[PDB]
């Protein structure tokens, strides 16, 4: 048993017709202190998987090393390590999910909420969640922490059920994700303006976008707001 110290906030994601998108800001908070401003919380595994992690950063860095070791280990005595016997998103997730549940069962959890986003060998979209309790679930949209409360409602307006996925393009999905990140910046006190975004497409592969910023913000209406009731 522990307490999280340096933490990362929301990770948000959704499926679209040809793949998945995942995003997370670049902040490492130390309680209310916005301590570290250049933290990458999206970690690609190969060219078909991106693992987004929120919660304790020291545990994130540990998980990051496990995934790096997983790639090394898979290549051992494996002539098809870059082909048929490459790591799948489903392999990477199940491994993490095993570790998370084992760690909670020893009463020594990895204090994280994780979303594994990727595309399988057959082109199928993969999007599944796992957390410090070992709880797992899948959905057309997935989000951790604050994203669960604010991003999901917005992302579910685009893809409300399974049948909406083929109707959703990558431009529409990315647009929805970027808007959700803006909303989180408005409303989450442990969020930052800077974020990373990754797209895993069955045709165009893995596109990893760094140093993105929340833009087109609305603040002008603040000038007219005066007092807290009667002040003019």
């Amino acid at each position: 048993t522990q307490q999280p110290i340096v933490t990362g906030t929301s990770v948000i994601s959704m499926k679209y017709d040809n793949g998945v998108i995942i995003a997370a800001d670049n902040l490492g908070s130390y309680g209310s202190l916005l301590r570290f401003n250049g933290v990458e919380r999206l970690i690609p595994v190969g060219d078909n998987t991106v693992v987004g992690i929120s919660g304790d950063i020291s545990d994130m860095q540990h998980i990051e090393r496990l995934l790096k070791d997983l790639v090394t280990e898979n290549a051992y005595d494996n002539p098809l390590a870059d082909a048929e016997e490459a790591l799948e998103p489903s392999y990477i997730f199940e491994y993490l999910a095993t570790v998370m549940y084992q760690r909670r069962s020893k009463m020594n959890p990895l204090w994280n909420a994780i979303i594994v986003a990727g595309v399988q060998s057959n082109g199928d979209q993969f999007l599944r969640y796992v957390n410090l309790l070992g709880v797992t679930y899948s959905s057309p949209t997935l989000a951790t922490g604050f994203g669960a409360h604010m991003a999901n409602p917005l992302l579910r307006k685009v893809v409300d059920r399974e049948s909406d996925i083929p109707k959703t393009t990558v431009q529409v999905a990315e647009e929805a994700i970027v808007n959700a990140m803006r909303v989180l910046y408005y409303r989450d006190a442990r969020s930052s303006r800077n974020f990373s975004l990754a797209i895993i497409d069955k045709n165009t592969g893995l596109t990893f976008k760094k140093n993105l910023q929340v833009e087109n913000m609305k603040w002008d209406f603040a000038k007219d707001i005066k007092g807290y009731g009667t002040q003019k």
Partner: protein, 222 residues
């Protein structure tokens, strides 16, 4: 302090017919007031004409089902591909559960199938392994809403034959699979109205001598 347990909500329902059995459960997964998934399967075909659901804390539920499926696999390896009977599966699950008596699987487990005479069978477990063969059993969040209804509409409790005024009970006539599914659907429709954790979808697994069949029905998403 770290709490190793959680509550993923959900409600499940097992009913044993004369020559069939159904195991139903909603497809909604939640924490607190949030929806995690509107479709996260909860009732599983475990092989050997057995269906299973472990409702409550989903991580423990997934772990138990996973271990039981594995037990079925090894039962075949160790005993010349012998079919695991529903009673034998039940006793096996008791030991899986009681093995963690002092750090329990926080779930209410129900399995369904056919017994060795081809009759419908449902078994119900508490978190630590105590179990019993039952005719009718709802589990999970809305179990208190559903069971009284089933006592009344399946077992005809408190129902008497008109004219006799309490002297003659309503006879316990056997229900068809179609009749049972109606009661299951109405049970979940009612539970969806009055319980916030119940909704989204209903997945029913029906077990006969011919195998395991699935039926899916939408539920209100509010």
């Amino acid at each position: 302090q770290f709490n190793p347990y959680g509550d993923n909500g959900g409600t499940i329902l097992g009913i044993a017919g004369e020559d069939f059995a159904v195991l139903a459960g909603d497809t909604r997964n939640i924490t607190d007031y949030s929806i995690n998934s509107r479709y996260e399967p909860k009732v599983f075909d475990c092989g050997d004409n057995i269906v299973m659901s472990a409702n409550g804390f989903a991580a423990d539920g997934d772990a138990l089902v996973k271990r039981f499926k594995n037990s079925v696999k090894w039962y075949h390896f160790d005993h010349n591909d012998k079919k695991l009977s529903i009673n034998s599966a039940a006793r096996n699950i008791q030991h899986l559960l009681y093995g963690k008596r002092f750090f329990p699987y926080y779930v209410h487990t129900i399995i369904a199938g056919l017994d060795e005479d081809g009759k419908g069978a449902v078994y119900s477990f508490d978190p630590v392994g105590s179990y019993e063969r039952e005719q009718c059993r709802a589990g999970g969040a809305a179990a208190s809403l559903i069971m009284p209804f089933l006592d009344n509409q399946v077992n005809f409790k408190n129902q008497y034959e008109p004219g006799t005024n309490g002297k003659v009970k309503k006879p316990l006539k056997y229900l068809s699979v179609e009749e049972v599914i109606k009661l299951v659907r109405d049970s979940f429709t009612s539970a969806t109205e009055r319980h916030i954790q119940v909704g989204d979808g209903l997945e029913i697994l029906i077990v006969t001598k011919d195998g395991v069949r699935k039926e899916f029905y939408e539920l209100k998403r509010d």
